[PDB]
């Protein structure tokens, strides 16, 4: 579930 | 401090193209686009990008064509990132300020990953009141309740999950909707429970319309999420909200 | 004053497509473009047109998107005519002024016939000081030496040929190049000689750099043009400048 | 020659 993930700076910028 | 001649030379070319797409040859267009994208991103998107130098280019772009200002300010690399995405991501808010003041920014435009510059604030640690005000201005130019394309998450959920209290405070000052649910049915309050952000749960519960009876796809309420995470302080605040 | 709901509705749909091309259908985009085009023209491009009503639509467009403001102000009909073309043509300068104040006008954009808004001023009579100042602002935003696609004529050549002294004075005040030549090799001074506009020939010859020896495609100077046209009075002014 | 023409409103607006 997305509510448990910790996204990083680079995951928000790139895919 | 000087205007990049390579940049300006390629912007003069693009100005003709934006006026008339037949005014540049194929070779000339590829070259000018490549140069503008590269130099503009050198100038504005770096960690150490200088806001005064950004402002000067924005004035020169304007004086070339109002359509060129818009096109350059919103030009995007292969991942859909603009100057606004990168300067928000580096927390270079004096540059963000200069970009916002151009009048042509698109604060809701999502990169290829699915996130807007508003959503990229979620990972920033705001240091000064100047930064806070820039962030507030950014928020008020777009839709703070929009959902990212990946998981349907909002800025508030992202900020809550990363423990960035000041970004949470700025969102709520712009009347962010706390009851929005992501694709799993998760709310911002449920993010606070998973990650055990006690103060942030407080801030959310202080929003009078905060709906604690919302459930995710498995039927979990925030209280259930809080109990399953062993977060007894947050669970306790929910007991008071349920009049106990 | 109420805004046109059909126009506003069609603008909202445009705002989406302009920002995100996968956020509107092409069937949907078609009908909205056509409506915006129809309605926006009817709003500002008639010979009746209230400047304030125009202004209050532009603010509402700008509050929707800066790119939307650009797209609407510069939207062109099947003749390539924009609101600035028609409003200049109709000599409705208060509407012209409100359009220029948008910051998004394209004052050099040529219509299908090959003429820009700057060129269309050649049929206006400048009555008020605000009409002069709007025309000067219009001139200084673009290239006054630009050449129409048909015959390569300048705004100056057109204004001389219709005898519009006030438009010639406005053009020369913004340092219009008197020596530009059209596809035939004709200058503005040659236009003045053909039509027998004595004062206007005087205004051109007052410009010190005016080159009276320039020849058209058949080898005629302005003096030759004048003499062939029976313009004794103009031909005499040339003699003074030759001595 | 264009220098002898007297163009109309309609000729400048419509092709």
Return the residue of B nearest to A10 by Cα.
Answer: B89
Resolution in angstroms, to 1 decimal, for this deposition?
A: 2.1
Q: Do A2 and B86 touch (CB under 8 A)?
A: no
Instruction: List the one residue out of C114, C170, C173, C113 whose CA is nearest residue C146.
Output: C114
Opening angle at CA B132, ends B148 and B69, nearest 5? 65
What tokens were used for C23? 């956020």
Q: Is B213 exposed, middle or buried (0-12, 13-18, 19+ CB in 10 A)?
A: exposed
CB atoms within 10 A of CB B208: 6
Element spanning C53, H or E: helix C51-62
Q: Is D15 on the interface with C (CB under 8 A)?
A: yes
Q: Is B1 exposed, middle or buried (0-12, 13-18, 19+ CB in 10 A)?
A: exposed
- Residue B129 phi, psi dihedral angles, 5° rounding: -65, -35
- The architecture that CATH gives domain B1-244 is Alpha Horseshoe (1.25)
Give percent helix, percent strand, percent coil of chain C, each to the nearest 5.
Answer: 60, 0, 40
Q: Is A4 on the interface with B (CB under 8 A)?
A: yes
Instruction: List the one residue out of C112, C172, C141 whose CA is nearest residue C164.
Output: C172
Q: Do B67 and C70 touch (CB under 8 A)?
A: yes
Task: Give pairs for C46-51: CB < 8 Å, separation 24+.
Answer: C46/C86, C46/C90, C47/C90, C47/C92, C49/C87, C49/C90, C49/C92, C49/C95, C50/C1, C51/C94, C51/C95, C51/C97, C51/C98
Quote the crossing angle between the two packed helices C66-73 and C51-62, to the nearest 10°: 140
Buried residues in C192-216 as b, exposed as e (16+ CB within 10 A): bbbbbbeebbebbbebeebebebeb
CB C96, CB C136: distance < 8 Å: no
Q: In sequence order, what are the residues at sequence separation of 6 or more whose Cβ sits closer than 8 angstroms to the Cβ of residue C83?
A: C40, C41, C44, C45, C73, C75, C95, C99
Instruction: List the one residue out of B101, B15, B107, B88 whose CA is nearest residue B49.
Output: B88
Return the residue of B nearest to C70 by Cα.
Answer: B67
> DSSP code of D15?
-
What tokens were used for A8? 């990083």
In this structure, which topology does domain C1-243 adopt according to CATH?
A: 1.25.40
Determine the distance from the C-alpha atom of residue B23 to the mean position of all C-alpha atoms in its chain, rounded to a whole number: 35
CA-CA distance, B231 to B235, in Å (whole number)? 6
Q: Is A10 on the interface with B (CB under 8 A)?
A: no
Chain B residue set in contact with A, beta carbons under 8 Å: 79, 81, 85-86, 89, 111-115, 119-120, 122-123, 150-151, 153, 157-158, 161-162, 182-184, 186, 190-191, 194-195, 216, 225
Q: Which residue carries 């028609």 as its tokens?
A: C86
Q: For an interface test with B, which of A12, A14, A15 has the most B Cβ atoms less than 10 Å from its Cβ? A: A12
Determine the distance from the C-alpha atom of residue B58 to the mean position of all C-alpha atoms in its chain, rounded to a whole number: 21
């Amino acid at each position: 579930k997305a509510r448990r993930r910790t996204t990083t700076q680079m995951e928000l910028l790139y895919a | 401090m000087e205007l990049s001649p390579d940049l300006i030379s390629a912007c003069l070319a693009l100005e003709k193209y934006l006026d008339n797409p037949n005014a540049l040859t194929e070779r000339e267009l590829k070259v000018a686009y490549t140069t503008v994208l590269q130099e503009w991103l050198r100038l504005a998107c770096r960690s150490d990008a200088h806001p005064e130098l950004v402002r000067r280019h924005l004035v020169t772009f304007r004086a070339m064509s109002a359509r060129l200002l818009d096109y350059v300010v919103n030009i995007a690399d292969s991942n859909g990132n603009t100057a606004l995405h990168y300067s928000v991501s580096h927390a270079n808010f004096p540059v963000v300020q200069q970009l916002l003041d151009s009048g042509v920014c698109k604060v809701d435009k999502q990169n290829r990953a699915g996130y807007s510059p508003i959503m990229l604030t979620a990972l920033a640690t705001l240091k000064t009141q100047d930064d806070i005000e820039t962030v507030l201005q950014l928020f008020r130019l777009g839709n703070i309740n929009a959902k990212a394309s990946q998981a349907g998450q909002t800025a508030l959920m992202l900020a809550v999950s990363h423990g960035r209290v000041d970004v949470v405070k700025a969102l709520l000052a712009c009347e962010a909707d706390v009851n929005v649910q992501d694709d799993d049915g998760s709310t911002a309050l449920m993010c606070a429970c998973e990650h055990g952000h006690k103060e942030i749960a407080g801030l959310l519960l202080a929003v009078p319309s905060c709906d604690i009876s919302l459930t995710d796809r498995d039927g979990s309420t925030a209280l259930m999420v809080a109990l399953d995470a062993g977060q007894s302080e947050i669970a306790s605040m929910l007991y008071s909200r349920m009049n106990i």
